Amino acid sequence: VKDTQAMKEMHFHPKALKDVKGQIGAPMPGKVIDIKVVAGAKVAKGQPLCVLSAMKMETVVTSPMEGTVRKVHVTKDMTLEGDDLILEIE
Amino acid sequence: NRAQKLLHYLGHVMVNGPTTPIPVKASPSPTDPVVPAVPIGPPPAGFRDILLREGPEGFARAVRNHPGLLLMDTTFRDAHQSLLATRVRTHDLKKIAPYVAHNFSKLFSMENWGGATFDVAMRFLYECPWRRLQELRELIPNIPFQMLLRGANAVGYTNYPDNVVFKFCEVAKENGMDVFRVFDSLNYLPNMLLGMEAAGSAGGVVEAAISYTGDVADPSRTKYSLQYYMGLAEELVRAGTHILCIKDMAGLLKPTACTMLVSSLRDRFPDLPLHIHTHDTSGAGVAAMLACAQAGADVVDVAADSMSGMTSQPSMGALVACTRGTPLDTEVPMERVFDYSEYWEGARGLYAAFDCTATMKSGNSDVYENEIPGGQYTNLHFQAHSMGLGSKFKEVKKAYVEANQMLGDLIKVTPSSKIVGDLAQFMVQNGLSRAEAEAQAEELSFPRSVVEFLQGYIGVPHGGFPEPFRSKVLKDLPRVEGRPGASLPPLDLQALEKELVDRHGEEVTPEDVLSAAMYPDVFAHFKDFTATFGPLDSLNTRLFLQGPKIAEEFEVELERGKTLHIKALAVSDLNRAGQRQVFFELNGQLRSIL
């Protein structure tokens, strides 16, 4: 008998696919310190745009390619896990 | 309002839980360690009186001439990170202090503080290290202290201005500190000279240690041969010291390496007493230490019986018992050792929430491949757990060797394994391999600490580091050359006092100013939390650690003459807005806490 009281749990958390290079994933889990790029802005090669903080770790996000961003999936001060959708660069 | 703040803190513990992250879910046992009976009289005379009556040189040749072997007990700094997570409270620590002062005088010097102790007492341990030294000065007026400092960057993990180091060193020596230890992560001589001259400027015994890495008896081992050690030793001795020491975190000193190194070093310095520091990780540390003692050893670091082995130092009992019918003649009674070990065996179970032997569980041979520091293994385990790689703990350390090979075979102790630890953690977190991480090292975002290391803020390695990798990572970033501290802009800490006073400071002492200038944000964390919840490190370690139940009457001696008996009479439920109420009984007073 298929149970109707399963109540499948909803979690969002946009996962970043490895095949797509424009999609950006978190190298480590942690909390975003700050974001350096607002939506619809221009990004450069080898330029920092986001910083991650852990218990005793800090990571700064380096832009993968050249272009413009479309949207910022992460806004500010959130618990981020590794390799999830945060920004896209075009 | 202090008692009310304490009751609020205890209730918050009971309903919510301990604030510090608990690595392993274990409940501390209700077994009170036995405090040994101590003599009434004053502590005997050791070697502190000799140094007080003389200069550093007097203490130096007093050590050198003495017939016998000198004991470095490390049951207060080394054993913590060697076994636990350097996660011990001070309250129970002042329970053998009269016993150590009174029974133990043949002891050379004691390892009170540490940089790790300072960091943990500013981050997680809600205590003040300057106090930690201050109340401990008056409990043992017999034996000199020994504290682990380093050359370029005194207490933090990145380089710091020279004047700042000058002021820490002078203030620390002022507090009553006795012996200064100085080293550097690399073999960078200017850092060593800076630390030596700081230790001298404070005024006192300046002891030099150097890291030992690789096999010095293997003919194949060519990067770190005997001559490289010898030349560096000659540099250090011309620099100007009092006692010469060896740093061995991984404990890779074989008996043959022992004897050859000791004979070679003593061969042309039969004047400097020698200090040896090692960890019993391979399991054969005791025989190597015996050979070192036979050859030329002067100061031998030995651990307490119940916090020994595993990743720790050799125990008291084996060293004392073997050296019975020999001229070496440690000449230290072992009956006291038995009770001291019994006290530590009781006290160790108090901290079971974070115990490496849950994962460690055995001797762990096959470290020559890993070459993992003894004082960093459990810390890496904890951080991997916190990030969430605790399940793949074996895999994380499988990636340490490859990161070491990426930046090459270099000496790794404090800011030299943690960066490679970050490298291995990244390696497993992205679940990738070495050669391609080398290949795509341009776009792949790398941890910032690794970038700072490649910048050379730590210094220049003895063997260098690969050019394509530094080119692909550093890319277009400005690079600091030579000794960064010399070009580093010295910072001023006077405005620190004014800013602290105008923000939350009302009686800040210069030592607190130093602590804030060293680690500001976490200092604010400490102070503004201790302002709300009241004065901590006044209650029993076990009582806070469990604090799990009601109708338990426990007394907290915040001040003498104030028992502050606390009886958790009952605990209520949710009234209207997710706020509960608890019943406490004071010494004679009922309090209803929310």
Add this chain to the structure above:
Amino acid sequence: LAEELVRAGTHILCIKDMAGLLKPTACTMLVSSLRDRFPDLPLHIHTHDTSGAGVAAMLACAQAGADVVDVAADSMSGMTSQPSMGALVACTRGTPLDTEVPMERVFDYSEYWEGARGLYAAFDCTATMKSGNSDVYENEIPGGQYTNLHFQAHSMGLGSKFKEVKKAYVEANQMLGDLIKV
């Protein structure tokens, strides 16, 4: 005793130590003494790493005259077990004794046991043995019984006062007199 045994007629002679009380001095003196009038018969030593410095004593015995050595796997060593593979294999590299056994294979052999020991969670040294204890000289307790002794005492229900049970052992020994217990 040894001369009587050799007059009886054997093939190999063995020295047993449950508690691991061969000091390096006692090691070398005893081994040389036995080897003095018999540099032909095979000699064996079997001890337990109970005190903690058993590796040093075993090395001394090997250097003097030892022939056969009892050594356990790394994950089943220490505490009150026998000396580990790793120490003996590693120390005898630039040494004429030359154990000469692939240490890489011993590594995996040890790892198997490190993994496998976790199944028997019921049967272990546990909290009675967080660290290798000394005062074995004062206890005179065979290392082969400590686990069975604790199991039996807990079976009666003396696990709580397991401490007093073992510090009663030495008075028991002297009440019967200093005799060898195996």
